[PDB]
From a paper:
Broad crystallization screening with human DHX9 alone and in the presence of nucleotide analogues (ADP, ATPγS and ADP–AlF4) using multiple commercially available crystallization screens did not produce protein crystals that could be optimized. As the structure of human DHX9 was of the greatest interest, seeds prepared from crystals of the species ortho­logues were utilized for crystallization efforts with the human protein. Using streak-seeding techniques, diffraction-quality crystals of human DHX9 were identified in the presence of ADP and Mg2+ in similar precipitant conditions as dog DHX9 and a 2.62 Å resolution structure of human DHX9 was determined. Despite similarities in precipitant and the use of either dog or cat DHX9 crystals to promote crystal growth, human DHX9 crystallized in space group C2221 with two molecules in the asymmetric unit. The second molecule in the human structure superimposes with a symmetry mate of cat DHX9 and similar packing interactions between human and cat DHX9 crystals were also observed in the extended space. Hence, DHX9 represents an inactive state of the enzyme. The inactive conformation of DHX9 lacks an open, continuous channel through which RNA could bind.
Residue numbers in the entry: 272 to 314, 320 to 588, 605 to 741, 747 to 1152
Write the structure that this text describes.
């Protein structure tokens, strides 16, 4: 049944007036109501784009390739290549013979499997434009190959002619490796090695230097070209990271027009024929060391040996071999294959210690969520205390201090257990690993108009098995049944086949590489047609691309921003409404976890409070940033005490803050005036129109995530399906479900598809805000308005038509703004009134809502 909307008469007239002034019309109600009318309305030429190549040039002595600028005012300013080379060599020779701690480290370096192949690798790279380096995870490709290359130029008095850029799929990899390589050279990051991820960098010195970076960073720098680089090392190509795949397309055209460049493709033990053929049948340098066999097991076995009994495609736990016992069979059938059996892992750990062979256990799990769950299951049991066990988590989102703990040795008599994601599959190798427990799962992000746990591939299961066979004969415990193993895919589908292409689409256009479809048709494995059509559709709707699929001034800005394009447009809209800072903060916050420390899953009494009365996880977040920033004014310890008092993750806040500042930077440079991006005090209780607008702009950004509240935790999603409010939400009630929301309409940040469907990052919006920014299709029969063919509003046909008219006027202003962003200082009066009407519609009062008194 429809939702009643109580507009005031004065508001009803105001809408009608501004529409009249904007020179728009109210489409009349339909003569026959059974045939409704579309209130949502629509509304250039430039050039055409042919095939182009990204330019290349080798290292120059008067050029810093990492800052992309000249060296005029330095101590190596007008120096000659030879002095630079000779100085850097003598520096190093000296360091080598004096530093006895460094010598020891270099001795460790020289035992790694890859050391053997040093000469073979350097010669190959010397000869051929492209080389593939192939070998097992742990031989030392990532850490050593870039050093081999650098040191080769240094020792041979060519140090000035060597700048190596190394790409990595993941942020934590570019940083960790940069720090590890720096340490192996007795340095801090910032000398010979550096890193550059989104929102964080420690640039290395301009000469004889290695930069580790994520592909996105490298891509976003490429519109200048690949300036002053001699080697491009594309690492971990076998992960089929979509941006790596894309970059490989760019680099193929590069090597073809500039054969003096050196590309180095580095890969785990897979069939690299794909990549070989792609790069003109390039050499393949094989690398290996000693492997020991690993006795692998499956969900059957695990139950057979532990004598486990659980608590009271098709399901593959119902299928078991005859050679297994009756209880094993009956026990395995009790387990649900959508979960990972945490009790069985505990049992397997106990089986391990009865083998009496010391060594670490490596446990593969999908996501932090399960690593935390498994952590608490264990620690809340005497046996797994500090005395017997050291249980360390491993994933992207933990302090780098605790990353390095996984490599540290442990007091003897203590089993080290690493609870890890797939980072520890091929990216990093943990030492003294004899045992592996494998969930056989993956946390991929399938979005089709959103995360999800799926089955890993045979290849994944094979490479997880191999982690336990680098020190002695190992064991691997797969938690999937044997019947499930057979129905597994041989390979994970590459991200290129199942990821949105909007960001790649803009990149192609920013770099003037040609048509989106034409370019992506040259990929080693081109993406599906529909994904290309979706990407093109989505960027035309945003006005990122024009009708000819050419890049607009809006699209250009969205391409320069390291954020999802929709959020990029939301940020420009914020600039227009002079709430830029708040929106940049919301945007920045999307790229990091929640700042809140959720010990218990249910949300605490202090965190709730930051919500105020806005029923908004987003407002909560803005409110902590304001309080954290105030608490910051008393220095480090005040910040520290504020954070662990209020139960917050201080690093998250600093990362988000620094992200924001850079997002603002790119806006400033794009022409937007400083005044629209100042920080603005606000309250989360009283009337605040700035925050009202921020909610409206939030509703635009997170669309199409919209939902309707039934009762308790139950909600409805955009296609009529139902789902739950996530426990982490401020809007989530206790075991007693009394919430009494002044509106049932929320927008949200994430769909978490576990066993159930959960909505995360929920923010209450008014029916008016829904109509304005959080809907596309609006249909009126005169009385009832139908929103995105599932939500039904009983509202004035005239009002709906006007709000829908505003939406379109706003979009139109965005276009004009992005041609000359500075004009927001001096908008014409009608546009000013149009902004003010949006300001007015954003108020809770505008929909007859009052937040200040308890409902
Ligand atoms: N931060 C680190 N701490 C300890 N050992 C490390 C670290 N980084 C790399 N190693 C060691 O280096 C070796 C693997 O080097 P790496 O270049 O990562 O191999 P791959 O060829 O798999 O890329 C292993 O012995 C691993 O434990
Ligand atoms: Mg590696």
């Amino acid at each position: 049944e429809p939702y009643k909307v109580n507009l005031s008469q004065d508001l009803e007239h105001q809408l009608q007036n501004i529409i009249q002034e904007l020179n728009l019309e109210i489409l009349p109600p339909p003569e026959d109501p059974s045939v409704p009318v579309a209130l949502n309305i629509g509304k250039p030429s430039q050039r055409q784009n042919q095939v182009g190549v990204v330019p290349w040039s080798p290292p120059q002595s008067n050029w810093n390739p990492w800052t992309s600028s000249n060296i005029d005012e330095g101590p190596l300013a007008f120096a000659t290549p030879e002095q630079i080379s000779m100085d850097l060599k003598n520096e190093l020779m000296y360091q080598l013979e004096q530093d006895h701690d460094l010598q020891a480290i270099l001795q460790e370096r020289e035992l790694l499997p890859v050391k053997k192949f040093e000469s073979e690798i350097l010669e190959a790279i010397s000869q051929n434009s492209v080389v593939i380096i192939r070998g097992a995870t742990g031989c030392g490709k990532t850490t050593q190959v870039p050093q081999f290359i650098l040191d080769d130029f240094i020792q041979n008095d060519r140090a000035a002619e060597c700048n190596i850029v190394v790409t990595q799929p993941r942020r934590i990899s570019a940083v960790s490796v940069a720090e590890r390589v720096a340490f192996e050279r007795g340095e801090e990051p910032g000398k010979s090695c550096g890193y550059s991820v989104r929102f964080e960098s420690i640039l290395p010195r301009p000469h004889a230097s290695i930069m580790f970076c994520t592909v996105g960073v490298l891509l976003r720098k490429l519109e200048a070209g690949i300036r002053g680089i001699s080697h491009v090392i594309v690492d971990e190509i076998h992960e089929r990271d979509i941006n790596t795949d894309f970059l490989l397309v760019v680099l193929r055209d590069v090597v073809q027009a500039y054969p003096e460049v050196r590309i180095v493709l580095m890969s785990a033990t897979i069939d690299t024929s794909m990549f070989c053929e792609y790069f003109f049948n390039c050499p393949i340098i094989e690398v290996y060391g000693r492997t020991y066999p690993v006795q692998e097991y499956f969900l059957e076995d695990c139950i057979q040996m532990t004598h486990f009994v659980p608590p009271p495609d098709a399901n593959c736990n119902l299928i078991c071999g005859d050679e297994y016992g009756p209880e094993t069979r009956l026990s395995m059938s009790q387990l649900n294959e959508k979960e990972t059996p945490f009790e069985l892992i505990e049992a397997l750990l106990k089986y391990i210690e009865t083998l009496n062979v010391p060594g670490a256990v490596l446990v593969f799990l999908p996501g932090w969520n399960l690593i935390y769950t498994m952590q608490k299951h264990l620690e809340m049991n005497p046996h797994f205390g500090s005395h017997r066990y050291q249980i360390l988590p491993l994933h992207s989102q933990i302090p780098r201090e605790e990353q390095r703990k996984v490599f540290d040795p442990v007091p003897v008599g203590v089993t080290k257990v690493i609870l890890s994601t797939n980072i520890a599959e091929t990216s990093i190798t943990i030492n003294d690993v004899v045992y592996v427990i494998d969930s056989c799962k993956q946390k991929v992000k399938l979005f089709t108009a959103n995360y999800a746990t799926v089955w890993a591939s045979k290849t994944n299961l094979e490479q997880r098995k191999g982690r336990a066979g680098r020190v002695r004969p190992g064991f691997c415990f797969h938690l999937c049944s044997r019947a499930r193993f057979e129905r597994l895919e041989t390979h994970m589908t590459p991200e290129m086949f199942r990821t949105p292409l909007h960001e790649i689409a803009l990149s192609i256009k920013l770099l003037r590489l040609g048509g989106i479809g034409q370019f992506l048709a040259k990929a080693i494995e081109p993406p599906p047609l529909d994904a290309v059509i979706e990407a093109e559709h989505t960027l035309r709707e945003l006005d990122a691309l024009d009708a000819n699929d050419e890049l607009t001034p809006l699209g250009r800005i969205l391409a320069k921003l390291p954020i999802e394009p929709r959020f990029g447009k939301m940020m420009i809209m914020g600039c227009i409404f002079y709430v830029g800072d708040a929106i940049c903060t919301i945007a920045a916050a999307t790229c990091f976890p929640e700042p809140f420390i959720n010990e218990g899953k249910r949300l605490g009494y202090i965190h709730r409070n930051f919500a105020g009365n806005r029923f908004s996880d987003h407002v909560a977040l803005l409110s902590v940033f304001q309080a954290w920033d105030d608490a910051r004014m008393g220095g480090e310890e005040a910040e520290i005490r504020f954070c662990e008092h209020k139960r917050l993750n201080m690093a998250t806040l600093r990362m988000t803050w620094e992200a924001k500042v850079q997002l603002k930077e790119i806006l400033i440079n794009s022409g937007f005036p400083e005044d629209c991006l100042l920080t603005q005090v606000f309250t989360n209780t009283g009337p605040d129109n700035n925050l009202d607008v921020v909610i409206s702009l939030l509703a635009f950004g997170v669309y199409p995530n919209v939902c309707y509240h039934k009762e308790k935790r139950k909600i409805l999603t955009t296609e009529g399906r139902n789902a739950l409010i996530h426990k982490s939400s401020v809007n989530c009630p206790f075991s007693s479900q009394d919430m009494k929301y002044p509106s049932p309409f929320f927008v949200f940040g994430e769909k978490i598809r576990t066993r159930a469907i959960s909505a995360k990052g929920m923010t209450l919006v008014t029916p008016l805000q829904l109509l304005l920014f959080a809907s596309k299709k609006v249909q009126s029969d005169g009385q009832i308005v139908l929103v995105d063919d599932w939500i039904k509003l009983q509202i004035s046909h005239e009002a709906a038509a006007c709000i829908t008219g505003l939406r379109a006027a706003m979009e139109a202003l965005v276009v004009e703004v992005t041609k000359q962003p500075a004009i927001i200082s001096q908008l014409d009066p009608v546009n000013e009134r149009m902004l003010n009407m949006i300001r007015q519609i954003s108020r809770p009062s505008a929909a007859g809502i009052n937040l200040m008194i308890d409902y």
